[PDB]
Symmetry: C3
Subunit: 291 residues, 3 copies
Amino acid sequence: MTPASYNLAVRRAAPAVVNVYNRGLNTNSHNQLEIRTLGSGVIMDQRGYIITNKHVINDADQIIVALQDGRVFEALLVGSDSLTDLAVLKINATGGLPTIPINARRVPHIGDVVLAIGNPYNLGQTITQGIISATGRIGLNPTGRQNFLQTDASINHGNSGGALVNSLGELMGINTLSFDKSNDGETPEGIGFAIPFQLATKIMDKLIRDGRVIRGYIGIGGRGIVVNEVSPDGPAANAGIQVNDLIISVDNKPAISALETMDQVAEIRPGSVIPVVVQLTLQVTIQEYPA
Amino acid sequence: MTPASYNLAVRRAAPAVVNVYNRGLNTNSHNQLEIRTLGSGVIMDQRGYIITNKHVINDADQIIVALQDGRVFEALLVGSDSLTDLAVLKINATGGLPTIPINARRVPHIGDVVLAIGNPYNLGQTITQGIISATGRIGLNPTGRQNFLQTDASINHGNSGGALVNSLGELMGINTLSFDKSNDGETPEGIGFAIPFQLATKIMDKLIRDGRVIRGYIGIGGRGIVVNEVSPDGPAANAGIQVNDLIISVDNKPAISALETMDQVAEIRPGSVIPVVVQLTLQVTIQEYPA
Amino acid sequence: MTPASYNLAVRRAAPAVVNVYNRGLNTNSHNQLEIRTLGSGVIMDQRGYIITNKHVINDADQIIVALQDGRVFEALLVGSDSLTDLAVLKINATGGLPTIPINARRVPHIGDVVLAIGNPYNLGQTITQGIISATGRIGLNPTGRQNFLQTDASINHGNSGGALVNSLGELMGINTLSFDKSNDGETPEGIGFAIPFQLATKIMDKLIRDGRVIRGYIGIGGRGIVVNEVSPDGPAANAGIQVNDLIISVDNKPAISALETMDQVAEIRPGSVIPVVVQLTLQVTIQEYPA
């Protein structure tokens, strides 16, 4: 017979994950480019756009990307975002580049076998398999390290930026980090997180068209949609809205949930204005999220 | 094609695992119900019975159970058992309850893919896959943390009480991982334990019919069946039997092994009496296991 | 339906993995055979040869081997090798022995599902599944703990010597197991190593025909094939070759790579002589690797 195996996935996607190297100049007294850090990255399209974790390329005087085919490139940082730890690099490749399979039509499911491609502890490219333990949201609104994708695939230090792909090689997400906890008593085995591919995608496109992800701020909270503690003063305060009420429509559509609502405000460019219901339609001008 | 995936099992059994919260009153000075601990639990039948680990609900002034569908319930402790760390709660659900798939006809096998549904570190429901690395016994006699079910599936803190199900959603066991994990000089990966479903079944039923699991005590040891150290002074001493001999028939059937023998004595209600053989048939009255 | 399962593989290969016990006499003051250590081992053929990790049987006054069928044997150490941590024992079994499936025709692939059979923490035989994350070389030349086989299958202490088999039971490698940490901060999760079956084979045969693995030493380094730091003063000095040049043909064949070249010199018995090329063909006598 044939042994059970996920090599097909490896063949189809592995060639697209890269080693990202963060090189600083002031790392030594002789001020030469030294490898301050390193992680992994996923070549997104043939134009040369590579996704990766921000915490990898932060304060990097240089960024080198290297392919499994041996080609080495200097990368231009086109933008990052703290609220997701995603960063978008760009190599200028002539000759063709391998690209991570993407299937925008595929919906990830709790339980789907998934492999994590990356370069942890800088041992070279390694693959590890697990399943999707929790899916998380593809919204643009930051919530925490719980609305990501969760996997029991082994995510070590060096998998950051790597690819989490299903058995068909399809990119399910960008590995971000492990769960190491905050303290001890023990270690959290098999609890890793990845940013959903669908979101990495949204973020990348923005990081390209703007050099930074522009989120629409409405400063309000809650649990229609409860408005519990709406004392940020930013946009809430400035133009209708109270420190305790219930909204009906974020802009001109239902305000069923709090999460699904914020996820809309953020997708609204600054300066714009929209009619906020509770039936006293009070308009408000959207600002830009805080630093 | 279609991504390899164990989602079917997740769909069939996930809805039945619950978040069990141990709330104490004297946890703070304002003596309010504070979440002293927490674990997971499996809704066993439509009557509202839920299995869980004892160590989760111990000394709980209150017990709250929450479903993935959002419904929350106050749970009535119907019993527990130290020798297995199993506890049976009971929520009073009108409207219908989701129930963990069970297939008493199914025999677990070393190597079967199995998923562990539970809520570790209180991150919300998480699934993790592994295989059965060892099966263990379904007996009622306590032996240790070796005659359980052993799985490399990721069992973290908060998986206690959760379900361990095979690819079909069939309940293979109740996650219980107990603490002997460590040596000296490095943390034990992929070695978790679960109580065979067959036994969790036996125990729950008893916890229901008696509020406590009543075990039949004999007071002997060994390796027919060797009667090594038979100096408990229990019912063994009180009625024939020596501090060094060989038994022939626990009650009126073969005494082939020591394990399979104890597992019978325990299934014999106290006060009863049975003929013990070795050919000098000496009768003995069964007592009840120690506290 | 049927539960997803790797049981077939377990049935086919588990029976061949054995518990290896290292018993020393001077472990106590009453100088009796005490279990100084322990690991696992794979019965390679019906003659009674068993492979294992050197670091298990080192300085063992005695060695006991035990089968899953219950049979116990006293083993004869036929040899070991440091550069691979492989040891070969030999039990003298009459009545027949179970043997690990081997398919020398099979080529291991990154991503192949694979199970690790072994006895970690001495809890009895345990199975764990993972995938091959990196393959490594089957050469006879020592390189490091990187040209081994790499798997995310859980390799714990007591898995050393165990077998790593694919879904068909086929022997993929002998679990070695690198001590993971070597420093702190975090712990290398899911990164285990095994010696390729293809090499364990080559090594065992040598350990048999010679009691020690005789390697052919040259004394050179580099990156044709660069000869960068050819100052070891062995046979390289003694008869042509410079401290900085480029070789053309290890013996009478291409010298394309440095790795694949050394892998040849080692397979050349001492005393022999071969023509080295670089076009000034200078012959050299092969010595024997250092202790």
